């Protein structure tokens, strides 16, 4: 394993290469996490082995998200949603690469589609997680964002390991996001969306479908999940992801 | 004058800094560079002004500066959205943080995309002949932009390069339209300019339909049947003075 930091257009972003003529796999979070939180568990899961195996993986943490990462300056111009997708051509470029299969959650999910929208002929398909087209302490507003021992797991990391500063201006750009022009314009490539039933995010993964090509694009609404796919079922979502990249012409 | 090679997230663009608070940055149309385009307007008299409190950095889009060499054969020439976002990276080769823009045609486009991405990095934008939508190589060009001429046809063919101009115009009208609404609109003041009896007067009134009135300003000039850097730089040297006063600089 490699750790190493992407001085990008706005900023360096931490990436974490991981694993073995195949296209690199990108990870981008969601709010309130950082990759170690968001998909270690899922990658180190036994389904999951054989893509590792078979393919290499970029996990990129958002900026300031990674693990004990210095708070920016007051004030900081924190870089937006499309900031932040205008980092990710400089990812591909730092490792010679010329495809990636994206894989984001809540905000990543937005980010990689927007990224794909701007830079088509990078992206050969886009796994997207809990994606949104459109007084509290922090670990508070993250468990009620996404939502037993993982919830205080998760508010466990999110204090110790991560930087509140950073994660407030990660969180505001978030929501100040504008929505993404799309029409049944729109997405060229295959699509995986999921979401579970009785999530947070039903009804905004179901339009963000509405909108994509269905010739292309499958939806997969898992029933015992209610949240977060990785965490609720990582092994039926295990299994989706070989299926997906299989129909693209690539081995699991 | 020193000009560069600026190292962008989709490879080079050529610019050429030249200047004396925001940066002047300037993006010329499909069929010309920066020398076709601007130097007219920026070596006039009514602008030796401007020239003097300002500092100027000209963009060539890629392939389109002075004896630029050929792309490779199939090179994905960046789009109109990839070609904003190298805008960025021009600004942080300089440790600039806003910028004054001024674009024609397809620089006008460019920027405007550039503006709603990064918004906190201008100040105001000067757009000529926008649109917000979507044979001899002299040819091609001159019916873009009217409807001597031959000032511009002899350096298309003696200066610049014809396969890198045909990649960057196939570019141009592969563009989708800008996701602008008069109330997400622009963030900045801005100057929509096109001549009376010009090609894209119906394109630039539609681009100002959609921009919102207290920060934006249309003006149709009234013989400019081309570019209004051509015809009457006068009208537009002041036209371009009085922009920048009214954010708090004083050409
Ligand atoms: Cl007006």
């Known amino acids: ?77 924190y870089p937006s949603m499309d900031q932040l997708a205008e980092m990710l051509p400089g990812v591909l470029q730092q490792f010679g690469l010329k495809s990636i299969i994206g894989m984001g959650t809540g905000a990543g999910a937005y980010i990689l589609t927007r990224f794909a929208l701007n830079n088509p002929e990078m992206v050969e398909g886009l796994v997207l ?3 949104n087209p459109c007084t509290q302490a922090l670990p508070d507003m993250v468990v009620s964002h996404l939502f037993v021992e993982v919830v205080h797991t998760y508010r466990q990391h999110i204090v110790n390991d ?37 999530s947070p995010a039903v009804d905004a993964v179901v339009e963000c479908n509405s909108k994509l090509d269905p010739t292309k694009t499958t939806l997969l609404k898992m029933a015992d999940c209610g ?21 693209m012409g690539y081995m699991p």
């Open 227 to 247: 949240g977060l796919p990785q965490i609720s079922q990582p092994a039926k979502l295990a299994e989706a992801f070989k299926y997906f990249v299989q129909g």
């Open 1 to 77: 394993v490699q750790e190493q930091d992407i001085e990008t257009l706005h900023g360096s972003v931490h990436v974490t290469l991981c694993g073995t003529n195949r296209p690199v796999i990108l990870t981008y979070h969601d709010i309130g996490m950082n990759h170690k939180t968001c998909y270690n568990p899922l990658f180190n899961y036994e389904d999951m082995q054989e893509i590792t195996q078979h393919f290499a993986v970029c996990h990129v943490d958002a900026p300031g998200q990674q693990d004990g990462a210095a708070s920016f300056p007051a004030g900081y111009m």
């Open 129 to 131: 997680i809990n994606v």
């Open 162 to 198: 991560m930087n509140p500063g950073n994660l407030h201006l990660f969180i505001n750009a978030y929501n100040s996001r504008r929505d993404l022009e799309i029409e049944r314009v729109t997405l060229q490539c295959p699509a995986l969306l999921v979401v579970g039933d009785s």
